[PDB]
Amino acid sequence: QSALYTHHQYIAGFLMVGAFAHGAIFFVRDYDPEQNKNNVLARILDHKEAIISHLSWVSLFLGFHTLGIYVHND
Amino acid sequence: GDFLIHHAIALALHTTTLILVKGALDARGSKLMPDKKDFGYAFPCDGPGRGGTCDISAWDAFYLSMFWMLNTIGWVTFYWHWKHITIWQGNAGQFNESSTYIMGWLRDYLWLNSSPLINGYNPFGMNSLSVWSWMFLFGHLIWATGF
Amino acid sequence: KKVSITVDRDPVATSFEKWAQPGHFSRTLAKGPKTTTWIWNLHADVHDFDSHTNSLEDISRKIFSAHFGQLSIIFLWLSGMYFHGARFSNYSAWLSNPTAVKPSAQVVWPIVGQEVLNGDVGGGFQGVQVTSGFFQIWRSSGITSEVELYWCALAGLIMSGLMIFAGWFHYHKAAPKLEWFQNAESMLNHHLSGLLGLGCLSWAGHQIHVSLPVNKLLDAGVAPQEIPLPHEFLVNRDLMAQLYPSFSKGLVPFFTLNWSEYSDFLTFKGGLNPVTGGLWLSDTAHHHLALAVLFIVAGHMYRTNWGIGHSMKEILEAHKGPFTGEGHKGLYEILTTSWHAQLAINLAMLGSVSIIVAHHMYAMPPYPYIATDYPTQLSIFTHHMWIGGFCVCGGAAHAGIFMVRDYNPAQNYNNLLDRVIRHRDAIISHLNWICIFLGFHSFGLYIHNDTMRALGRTQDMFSDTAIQLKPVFAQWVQSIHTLAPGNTTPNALATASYAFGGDVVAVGNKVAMMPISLGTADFMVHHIHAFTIHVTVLILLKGVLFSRNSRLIPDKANLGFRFPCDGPGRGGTCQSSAWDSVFLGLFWMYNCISVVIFHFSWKMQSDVWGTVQSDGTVTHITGGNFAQSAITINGWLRDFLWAQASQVIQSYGSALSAYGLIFLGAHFIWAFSLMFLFSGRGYWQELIESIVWAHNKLNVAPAIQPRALSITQGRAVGLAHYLLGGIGTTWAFFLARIISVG
Amino acid sequence: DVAGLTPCGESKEFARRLDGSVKKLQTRLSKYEAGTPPALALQKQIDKTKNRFDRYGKAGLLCGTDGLPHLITDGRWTHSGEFVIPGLLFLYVAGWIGWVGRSYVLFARTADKPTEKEIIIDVPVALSFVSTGFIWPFSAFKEFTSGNLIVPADEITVSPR
Amino acid sequence: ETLNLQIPSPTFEGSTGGWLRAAEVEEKYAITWTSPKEQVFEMPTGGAAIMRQGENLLYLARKEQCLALATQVKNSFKITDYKVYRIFPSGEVQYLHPKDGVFPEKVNAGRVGVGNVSHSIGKNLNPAQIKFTSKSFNG
Amino acid sequence: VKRGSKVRILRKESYWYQDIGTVATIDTSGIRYPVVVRFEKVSYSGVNTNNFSLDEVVEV
Amino acid sequence: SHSVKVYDTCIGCTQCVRACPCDVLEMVSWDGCKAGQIASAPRTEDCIGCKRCETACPTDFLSVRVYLGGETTRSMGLAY
Numbered sequence A: 001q002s003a004l005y006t007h008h009q010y011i012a013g014f015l016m017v018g019a020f021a022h023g024a025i026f027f028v029r030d031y032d033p034e035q036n037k038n039n040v041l042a043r044i045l046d047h048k049e050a051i052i053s054h055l056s057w058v059s060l061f062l063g064f065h066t067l068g069i070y071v072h073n074d
Numbered sequence B: 001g002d003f004l005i006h007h008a009i010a011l012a013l014h015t016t017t018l019i020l021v022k023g024a025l026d027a028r029g030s031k032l033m034p035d036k037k038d039f040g041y042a043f044p045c046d047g048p049g050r051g052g053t054c055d056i057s058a059w060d061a062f063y064l065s066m067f068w069m070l071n072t073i074g075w076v077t078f079y080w081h082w083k084h085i086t087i088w089q090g091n092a093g094q095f096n097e098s099s100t101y102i103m104g105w106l107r108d109y110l111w112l113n114s115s116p117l118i119n120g121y122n123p124f125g126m127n128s129l130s131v132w133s134w135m136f137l138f139g140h141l142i143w144a145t146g147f
Numbered sequence C: 001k002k003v004s005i006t007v008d009r010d011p012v013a014t015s016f017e018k019w020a021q022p023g024h025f026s027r028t029l030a031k032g033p034k035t036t037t038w039i040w041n042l043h044a045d046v047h048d049f050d051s052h053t054n055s056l057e058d059i060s061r062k063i064f065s066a067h068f069g070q071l072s073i074i075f076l077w078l079s080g081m082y083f084h085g086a087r088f089s090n091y092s093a094w095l096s097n098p099t100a101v102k103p104s105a106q107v108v109w110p111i112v113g114q115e116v117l118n119g120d121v122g123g124g125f126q127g128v129q130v131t132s133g134f135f136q137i138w139r140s141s142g143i144t145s146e147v148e149l150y151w152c153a154l155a156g157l158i159m160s161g162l163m164i165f166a167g168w169f170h171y172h173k174a175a176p177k178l179e180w181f182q183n184a185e186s187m188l189n190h191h192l193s194g195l196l197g198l199g200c201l202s203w204a205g206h207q208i209h210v211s212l213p214v215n216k217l218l219d220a221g222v223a224p225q226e227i228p229l230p231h232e233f234l235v236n237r238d239l240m241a242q243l244y245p246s247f248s249k250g251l252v253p254f255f256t257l258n259w260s261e262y263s264d265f266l267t268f269k270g271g272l273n274p275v276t277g278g279l280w281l282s283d284t285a286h287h288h289l290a291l292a293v294l295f296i297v298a299g300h301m302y303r304t305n306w307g308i309g310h311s312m313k314e315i316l317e318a319h320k321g322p323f324t325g326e327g328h329k330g331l332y333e334i335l336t337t338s339w340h341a342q343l344a345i346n347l348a349m350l351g352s353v354s355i356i357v358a359h360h361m362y363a364m365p366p367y368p369y370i371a372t373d374y375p376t377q378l379s380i381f382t383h384h385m386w387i388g389g390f391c392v393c394g395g396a397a398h399a400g401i402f403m404v405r406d407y408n409p410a411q412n413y414n415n416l417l418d419r420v421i422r423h424r425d426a427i428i429s430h431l432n433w434i435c436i437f438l439g440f441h442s443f444g445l446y447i448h449n450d451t452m453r454a455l456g457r458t459q460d461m462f463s464d465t466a467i468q469l470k471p472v473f474a475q476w477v478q479s480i481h482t483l484a485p486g487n488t489t490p491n492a493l494a495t496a497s498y499a500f501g502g503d504v505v506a507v508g509n510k511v512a513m514m515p516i517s518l519g520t521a522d523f524m525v526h527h528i529h530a531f532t533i534h535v536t537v538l539i540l541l542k543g544v545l546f547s548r549n550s551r552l553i554p555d556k557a558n559l560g561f562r563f564p565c566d567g568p569g570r571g572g573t574c575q576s577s578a579w580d581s582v583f584l585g586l587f588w589m590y591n592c593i594s595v596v597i598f599h600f601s602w603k604m605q606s607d608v609w610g611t612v613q614s615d616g617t618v619t620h621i622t623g624g625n626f627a628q629s630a631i632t633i634n635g636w637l638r639d640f641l642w643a644q645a646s647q648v649i650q651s652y653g654s655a656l657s658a659y660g661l662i663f664l665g666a667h668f669i670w671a672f673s674l675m676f677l678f679s680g681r682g683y684w685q686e687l688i689e690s691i692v693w694a695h696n697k698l699n700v701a702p703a704i705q706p707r708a709l710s711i712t713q714g715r716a717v718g719l720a721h722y723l724l725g726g727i728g729t730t731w732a733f734f735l736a737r738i739i740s741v742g
Numbered sequence D: 001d002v003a004g005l006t007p008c009g010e011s012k013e014f015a016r017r018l019d020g021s022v023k024k025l026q027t028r029l030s031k032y033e034a035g036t037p038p039a040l041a042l043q044k045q046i047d048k049t050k051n052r053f054d055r056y057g058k059a060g061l062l063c064g065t066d067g068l069p070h071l072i073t074d075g076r077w078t079h080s081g082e083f084v085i086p087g088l089l090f091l092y093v094a095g096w097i098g099w100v101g102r103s104y105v106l107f108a109r110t111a112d113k114p115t116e117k118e119i120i121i122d123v124p125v126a127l128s129f130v131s132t133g134f135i136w137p138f139s140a141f142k143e144f145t146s147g148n149l150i151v152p153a154d155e156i157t158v159s160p161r
Numbered sequence E: 001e002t003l004n005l006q007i008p009s010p011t012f013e014g015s016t017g018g019w020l021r022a023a024e025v026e027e028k029y030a031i032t033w034t035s036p037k038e039q040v041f042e043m044p045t046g047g048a049a050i051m052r053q054g055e056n057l058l059y060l061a062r063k064e065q066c067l068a069l070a071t072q073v074k075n076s077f078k079i080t081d082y083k084v085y086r087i088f089p090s091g092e093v094q095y096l097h098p099k100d101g102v103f104p105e106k107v108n109a110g111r112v113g114v115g116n117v118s119h120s121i122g123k124n125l126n127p128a129q130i131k132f133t134s135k136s137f138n139g
Numbered sequence F: 001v002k003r004g005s006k007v008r009i010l011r012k013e014s015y016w017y018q019d020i021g022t023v024a025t026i027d028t029s030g031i032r033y034p035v036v037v038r039f040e041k042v043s044y045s046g047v048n049t050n051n052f053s054l055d056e057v058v059e060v
Numbered sequence G: 001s002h003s004v005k006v007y008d009t010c011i012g013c014t015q016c017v018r019a020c021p022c023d024v025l026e027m028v029s030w031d032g033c034k035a036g037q038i039a040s041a042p043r044t045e046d047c048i049g050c051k052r053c054e055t056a057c058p059t060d061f062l063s064v065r066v067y068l069g070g071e072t073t074r075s076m077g078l079a080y
C-alpha cells in the first residue's frame, strides 16, 4: 500500500511537470499569433503579468502563514 | 495536523505551478530577452550583459520547477506514510500530537522510523533489509553528487 | 637615522557631512542609486580601500585606523565577558566546587516562556551554561572574586575607549606618512622583541607572583576568600617563601647565573597536575619566560638605525640556486608595497596557528579543571578549527587579489613567482592526480567496507579483525614520545601529553586525558583528512595561479578578481574568476573541517572521555564503538549522527530547547541557501518584472528600480547561508549532545 | 461541541496538561530554599502557568482529545475572537502600512531627486504620512472611485508578448 | 607582405602554457610587431617575456591569444605595428589582422557589409511560420 | 513631434514601451530613427536615451 | 560557427568592434545613421560566442545579436 501510493504520486508529479514543459515548447515552437488573434490563448498572453503576479501573491500568502504557524507551534 | 499539512501541500502546488506557468508564458519573450523565441527552448543564457541572464530560458523554468515538484511529492508522501503507519500501530494520537510542529516530523517520523533501516547491516550481522540499507546510502550519495 | 617618525598633521576634517552621503568613497556610487544593485554595491566594496584610492599612503592610513577600530571592538567584547562573569554568573560557587557546578554567565529575561532556558546549572543559580572556558582562564589567573572581575571589565572598557580615540587621532589628527609604514625591519624588531617578548615576560611575572601562589593555595584546598590578596604575595616575601622556598634568595640567583635555585617554580615537570587535570603552572611560567628571552633575542636581528643587523632584502636576494633562476629577488618590494600580499601570508599563518592551537589545547589541557569540562573542550576545539579554516581560505583570496591587481611582470622577471606561473600546468596536473588517487584510496576503502558488510563478508573488510591497515608510523611516533621522559628528554619527569601513552588522569571521577590509540579506523580517517586538505589546496591554488590568464580566457586580469563569467562562448566560462575558486574552496573547507570535528567528537567520546570506576576501568561516553563502526559510512550515519542526535531532538521543554530550536533553524537556513546556489539571476529578474507590473498597476512602483541580485552576489548569498546553516546545525548538535552527556 | 470537540473547562486532558505542567515546575522548585531568587522565579512561573490554564478554561476555547485548545474558523460568531476579529485588526494595520507607504512613494516621485528620498527619508513628511493611515479604508476607496488608485493598461510597461 | 619566418622572437624562458599537438597538426597563429625598445611584456600563455628592439615574432595556438597580446602592447607600449597570421601544417600562411591594412574600428572603402539585417530586431519572424520551411527568421 | 515634448513609446521591443520620455532632438537627414528620446528610468544596460522613428513615438 | 547579425538600429558607435576579442566585426559605410557607418560581421568563423559585442552596444535592444550555433575548434576556444 505504501509503495503503490508513493509510486503513483511520483509518476503523477512527473506527468504534471511534463505537461507544462510541453506547453512551453508549444508557445516557443508551434504557436502562431496571427492565426490566434484575440483567442483564449492570445488573451492569456495579454494578461500573463496578472496571472504570474497573483500566483506570486497566493504562494507568499500561503508560505508566510503556513511557515509562521508551524514555527509558532515549534 | 492535517490542516497544516494540507496548507503546505497547497503552497507547494502553487509555487511549482508559478515556475511552470511563468516558464510557459515568458517563453516567447520578456523584458530581459524580448526575442527569446528566436533562440529556442533550451539555451544556456544570454551572457553577462544587461545585469546577467543565467537561467533565462523556458527550459530553465522546467529545471527550477523539478525541485519544487520533488518537494511537493515529498510533503505528500511523508504525510500519507506517517498518518498510515501511526494508524497501523493503533497509535494515531502520535501523529495527532506530533504533526503540529516540525520537530514532531523530525524525531517521530524520520528519526524514529530510521532505526530498522539503518540496522540492516551493522558490526553484529545483517538481515534481508541490508539491501534497502545499502540503497539508502546509495541514494544519499547520488543526491549529493548532484550538488 | 633613516628610521624616523613622520606625520601629517590634521589631514582629514572631523565632519558629519560625508556620513549623510552614502557611497562618498567611490566615483560610481557617489552619484546615487538608480537601481537596488547600488545598495548592494555600496556594502560590497566599502572596505576595499585600494579600489577607491590610488595612493598607497592614504590606503595605509585607512588600514591603520581600521585596525584600531577592530581593537576597540575586541576590548569592548572582553570587557563584556568580564562584566557578565562579575554580575550574572555563578563563578564564586564554581571556585568552591568546580567538579559539580556547571559554568553559567548568561541569564535570560522572562518574556514568552523563554525563561525555561535558565536551567539548573548549580551553585544556587539559574542560567545558560557557557562553554567558552572563561571560568578556567580566570581561575588560572587567580581571580577568586567577582570584584576583581569588575576591575578587569573596567580595564577592558578603558582600553576600548583608548583604541577608538587612537584610531580617530591617527586618521584625522596625526596620520603617518607612507615611509613610516614601509619600515619592515623596525616593525618586526618591535613586534618580536616588544609585543611578543615583553608580553611573554610580563605574563611570566604575573604567573610567578600571582597565579602560582593563588593556585597552589587553591589546589591545597584553601577556600577562595581565605586566600591572601595578590599584592600581599608581592610585598611579604616570607609567605611566598613558605609556598616556594627559592624566593628566600631573591634575584641574586638570576643575575649570577645560578638558575637551578629557581627549580621550585621554574620546573620542567610535564604531564598534568593530578588535582586539576591541567598543565603545571610552574611549567607554563618557565615556558613563557623561555619564550620571552627567545622573542627579545629574535627582535635584534634586523637593521634599523645603527649598522648592526640584517637587511631583509639582502637575505632574500642571496638565496638563489641553479633550479630557481633569480630566486627570491623582488619579494621584498612586493611585501612592502602590497597590503594584499601581506594579508595573504598573515591569514594563512593565523589560520594555521589556530588549527595548531586546536590540537595542542585538547591534548595538553592548559587550564585548571578545563580537561573534565567536556563541553568546553569540544567547544574550543570546534571553534578554533573553524577560525583556522576560514582564515586559510582568506589567504588564498588575497593571494588572488594580489595576482590580479598588485602583480607586475616587469619587476617579477625570472624570479620565483614568474617560474611558478610558468609551470602551473605541471603543478595543477600533479595536484589533480594526487586528489583523484587519494579520494579513490581513502573514500573507496569506506565504500569497499559498506559493500562487504552489507554482503555478509566481514572477513573481506579493511578492519582490525579482517585485513588490517595499521598506522605504523603514527604508532611508532607515539612510542617515541612515551619513551622520551628520562631518555631523549632526560630532565623531563612526564610525557608532554598522555595522548601518546602512559597513565589515565582522572579528575572528579572523569577522565582528563588517557592514551588515544590508533587503529584501522584512524588510518582511514587520517587519509580522509589528507584528501580533503589536498583538493581544497587544488581549488585555491588553481584560482591563484590562473587568476590573470588561462588557455580559456587569455586576458582574465583585465576582467578583474571578481567577475561572474566571460559569456556563454568557448563552451561557457561561468565561474572562471579567482573569486569563484575562493567561492568553491570554502565549500571544500567546510567539508574538511566538518569531518575533522566529527572525527574528534566521536573519537574522544568513544575512547577518551568517560567516568573512571572500581578496579580502575573506564566507562566511555559511547563505549568504544569507534574502532569497529568508523570503518563504514553506515557506522558514521547510525552510530554517530543518528545515535548522538537523540539529545538535540529530545531537548524540547528543557533548558536545552534553545539548541533544539537552533538545530531546526540552521537546517532551514541551509536548505534556503540552495535556492540561491542552484538558481540563476535571469529567472528572478523576469519574475521581478511581473511583480513590478502589479506595483505599476496600483501606482506604487519604487523609484529605486528593483533588480535581482548580481551573479556574484547570488553566489555569495548562497555560500553565506550554506555556511551558516551547516555550521549552525553542527553547533547545536555538538552543544546539546555534550552538555547532556559530558 | 463543534466538530466533536470538548470545551476546555470540562475536558479532563486539559486538566492533566495543567497538572503535569505544574509538577514539572514543582520538582525543580524542590531543589532550592524558600527565599532564594531561583525559588521566587519558579513560584512566579507556577502562578503564571496556573493563570494561563484557568483563563483558557473560562474563555470558550474548545479542547481536542489531546486536551490542547482548538480554533474554529468557519465564520460562526461564537468563535469570532479566534480568527475573524484578530483578522479585522490585522487588515486594518496592514492596510494602514500599505496606504502610508504608497502615499510616501507618490510624494517622493515629485521630489528633486526621487531616489534620494527613499534611502534618506524625509522624516517630518513621512511622519505626516504615518499619521494619515487611521482612515485608510475611506481614503483608499475614494482614491479608487476618483480614478487615482488604478492606472490604465496603456501607461504600464509590459513584455513583448 | 608574407611572413618572413626568420624574424627573431622575444626572449623567453619557456612555459607549460604554450602550444600543443593541435598546433602542428591543425593550425598555428603568428604575431609580428616592431618595438622601439628591449622591454618586458606579459605573455598570454604565462609569465613574462622580453621583446627585442626591432622586429618580434611569436607563435600562439589561438587567434584570441594573438589579439590579447596585440591589445596589451597597443595600450602599454603604444605599438600598433602588429600583424597577425594564420599558418597551416601545409606551410601556407594566411594574413589575418588587420585584414585590409586598416583596423576594423576605422571605416574603409571596399568593405562589403556582411550580416546586416534591413529591419530592427523585433521585426523577425516567429518560429511557427518558418517551421518545416527553409526560410530564414530574419524576415 | 517637437523637442521638449512628452511622448509615449510604441516600440514593443523597447525597455520603455508604453512609458513617457522626452524628445531631445529630431534629425532632418535620411535617418531611419531620427527622434532622440530620454527617460528617467534606466534600462537593464543602464542607458537612459534611445533613438526612435516617428511612427514609434506618440505625443501625450 | 556562430551567426552574428547587425540590425539597422545601429548608431555607428564602433563599441562592438573595439570590444570584440576575435576580430569578427568591422565598420562599413552606410547612410542610414548619423555617424554614417554600420557594423558588419565578415569573419563569423572566428566568433567564439563571448557576446562582448552585445554588452558594449548602447541601443535599447541590441543592434548586434549573436546566435550561438554549431561548435568548432575556433568557436570552442580550444588551444588543444
Ligand code: CLA
Residues within 6 Å of the ligand: C076, C077, C078, C079, C080, C081, C083, C084, C088, C106, C107, C108, C109
Ligand atoms: C560586547 C559584548 C556584549 C554582548 C554580546 C552582551 C550581551 C548581553 N548583555 Mg551585556 N554588557 C556588555 C557587553 C555585552 N553584552 C558590556 C560591555 C557591559 C558593560 C556596560 C554590559 C552590561 C550589561 C548589563 C548591565 C546587562 C547586560 C545584558 C545583556 C543581555 C541583553 C542585552 C539587551 O537585550 O539589552 C538591550 C538594551 C537596549 C537598550 C536595546 C538597544 C537596541 C538598540 C536599538 C541597538 C541599536 C544599535 C545602533 C542602532 C548602532 C548604530 C548607532 C547609531 C548612531 C546609528 C545580552 C545577553 C542584560 C542581562 O544580562 O540581563 C540578565 C543586562 O541587564 N549587559
Ligand code: CLA
Residues within 6 Å of the ligand: C063, C064, C067, C068, C071, C180, C181, C183, C186, C187, C190, C191, C194, C195
Ligand atoms: C614596542 C612597540 C610596539 C608594540 C607593542 C606594538 C604593538 C602593536 N602594533 Mg605595532 N608598530 C611599532 C611598535 C609597536 N607595536 C612600530 C615601531 C611601528 C612602526 C614601524 C609599528 C607599526 C604598526 C602598524 C602599521 C600596525 C601595528 C599594529 C600593532 C598592534 C597589533 C595587533 C595586536 O596584536 O594588538 C593587540 C595586542 C595588544 C597587546 C593590545 C595592546 C595595546 C597597546 C598599544 C600595547 C602597548 C601598551 C604599552 C606599551 C604597555 C604599557 C605597559 C605598562 C602597563 C607597564 C599591536 C598593538 C597594527 C594595529 O592593530 O594597529 C592598531 C597595525 O596595523 N604596528
Ligand code: CLA
Residues within 6 Å of the ligand: A056, A059, A060, A061, A062, A063, A064, A067, B015, B018, B019, B064, B065, B067, B068, C668, C671, C672, C673, C674, C675, C676, C678, C679, C687
Ligand atoms: C527551505 C528552503 C526554501 C525556502 C524557504 C524557499 C522559499 C521560497 N522559495 Mg525557494 N527554492 C529552494 C528552497 C527554498 N525556497 C530550492 C532548493 C529551490 C530550487 C533551486 C528553490 C526554487 C525556487 C523558485 C524557482 C521559486 C522559489 C520561490 C520561493 C518562495 C515560495 C514560498 C513563498 O512564496 O513564500 C514563503 C516565504 C518565505 C519562506 C520567506 C521566509 C520569511 C523570512 C525567513 C522572514 C524572516 C526575516 C528575518 C527576521 C530575517 C533575519 C535576518 C538576520 C540577518 C537578522 C519562497 C521565498 C518562488 C517565489 O519567489 O515565489 C514568489 C519561485 O519562483 N524558490
Ligand code: CLA
Residues within 6 Å of the ligand: C043, C044, C045, C046, C047, C048, C049, C343, C347, C390, C391, C392, C393, C394, C395, C397, C398, C401, C561, C562, C579, C582, C586, C720, C724
Ligand atoms: C584579517 C582578515 C581580513 C581582512 C582585513 C579582509 C579584508 C578584505 N577582504 Mg578578505 N577575507 C578574509 C579575511 C579578511 N578580509 C577571510 C577570512 C576570507 C575567507 C572567507 C576572505 C575572503 C575574501 C573574498 C572572497 C573577498 C575579500 C575581500 C576583501 C576586501 C573588501 C571587504 C569588504 O568591503 O567587505 C564588506 C563586508 C561585508 C559585506 C560583510 C558581510 C559578510 C558576511 C556575509 C557577514 C558576516 C556574517 C556574520 C559573521 C554572522 C551573522 C549571524 C547570523 C546568525 C545572523 C578587504 C580588502 C573582497 C574583495 O574584492 O577585495 C578586493 C572579496 O571579494 N576577502
Ligand code: CLA
Residues within 6 Å of the ligand: B141, B144, B145, B146, B147, C432, C433, C435, C436, C437, C438, C439, C440, C443, C444, C447, C535, C538, C539, C584, C587, C588
Ligand atoms: C557526494 C558528493 C560529491 C562527490 C562524490 C564529488 C566527487 C568529486 N569532486 Mg566534487 N563537489 C561536490 C560534491 C561531490 N564531489 C560539491 C557539492 C561541490 C560544490 C562546491 C563540489 C565541487 C568540486 C570541485 C570544485 C572539485 C571537486 C572535485 C571532486 C573530485 C575529487 C577527486 C576524487 O576524489 O576522485 C575520486 C572519486 C571519488 C572519491 C568519487 C567516488 C568514487 C568511489 C570511489 C566509487 C567509485 C565507483 C566506481 C567508479 C564504479 C564503477 C562501475 C560503475 C560505472 C558501474 C571527485 C570527482 C575536485 C576535482 O575534480 O579534483 C580532482 C575539484 O576540484 N568537486
Ligand code: CLA
Residues within 6 Å of the ligand: A053, A054, A056, A057, A060, C690, C691, C692, C694, C695, C698, C700, D097, D098, D099, D100, D101, D102, D104, D121, D126, D127, D129, D130
Ligand atoms: C509600502 C510599500 C509597498 C506597497 C504598498 C506594496 C504593495 C504590494 N506589493 Mg510589494 N514590496 C514592497 C513594498 C510595497 N509593496 C517592498 C519594500 C518589497 C521588497 C521586499 C516588496 C516586494 C513584493 C513582492 C515580492 C510581492 C509584492 C506584492 C505586492 C502586492 C500585494 C500585497 C503583498 O503581497 O504584500 C507583500 C509585501 C511584501 C512582500 C514586502 C512588504 C515589506 C514591507 C512590510 C512594506 C514596505 C514598507 C515600506 C518601507 C513603507 C515605508 C513607509 C514610510 C516611508 C512612510 C501589492 C501590490 C506581491 C504581488 O505582486 O502581488 C500581486 C508580490 O508577490 N511586493
Ligand SMILES: CC1=CCCC(C)(C)[C@H]1/C=C/C(C)=C/C=C/C(C)=C/C=C/C=C(C)/C=C/C=C(C)/C=C/C1=C(C)CCCC1(C)C
Residues within 6 Å of the ligand: A019, A020, A022, A023, A024, A026, B021, B024
Ligand atoms: C502551460 C500551457 C500552455 C498552453 C498550452 C497548455 C499545454 C494547454 C498549457 C498547459 C496547461 C496545464 C498543464 C494545465 C493543467 C490543468 C489542470 C491540472 C487542470 C485541472 C482541472 C481539474 C478540475 C477542473 C477538477 C474539477 C473537479 C470538480 C469540478 C469536482 C466537483 C465535485 C464533484 C462533482 C464531486 C465532489 C463534489 C464537487 C467538489 C462539487
Ligand SMILES: CC1=C(C/C=C(\C)CCC[C@H](C)CCC[C@H](C)CCCC(C)C)C(=O)c2ccccc2C1=O
Residues within 6 Å of the ligand: C675, C676, C677, C679, C680, C681, C684, C685, C707, C708, C709, C710, C711, C714, C715
Ligand atoms: C531568491 C533569489 C533572488 C531574488 C532575491 C532578492 C531580490 C533579495 C531581496 C530580499 C529582500 C529585498 C531583502 C532581504 C532582507 C532579509 C530580511 C534578510 C536581510 C539580510 C541582510 C542583507 C540584512 C536573486 O536575485 C538570485 C540571483 C541569482 C541566483 C539566485 C537568486 C535567488 O535565489
Ligand code: SF4
Residues within 6 Å of the ligand: B044, B045, B046, B047, B048, B052, B053, B054, B055, C564, C565, C566, C567, C568, C572, C573, C574, C575, C680, C711
Ligand atoms: S554565468 Fe550566467 S551568464 Fe555568464 S555564462 Fe554562465 S550562465 Fe551565461
Ligand code: SF4
Residues within 6 Å of the ligand: C569, G004, G019, G020, G021, G022, G023, G024, G025, G046, G047, G048, G049, G050, G051, G052, G053, G054, G066
Ligand atoms: S560574440 Fe564575441 S567573438 Fe563573436 S562577434 Fe561578439 S564579441 Fe566578437
Ligand code: SF4
Residues within 6 Å of the ligand: G006, G009, G010, G011, G012, G013, G014, G015, G016, G017, G038, G039, G053, G056, G057, G058, G059, G062, G063, G064
Ligand atoms: S552594433 Fe551597437 S555597438 Fe556596434 S556599432 Fe552598432 S550601435 Fe555601436
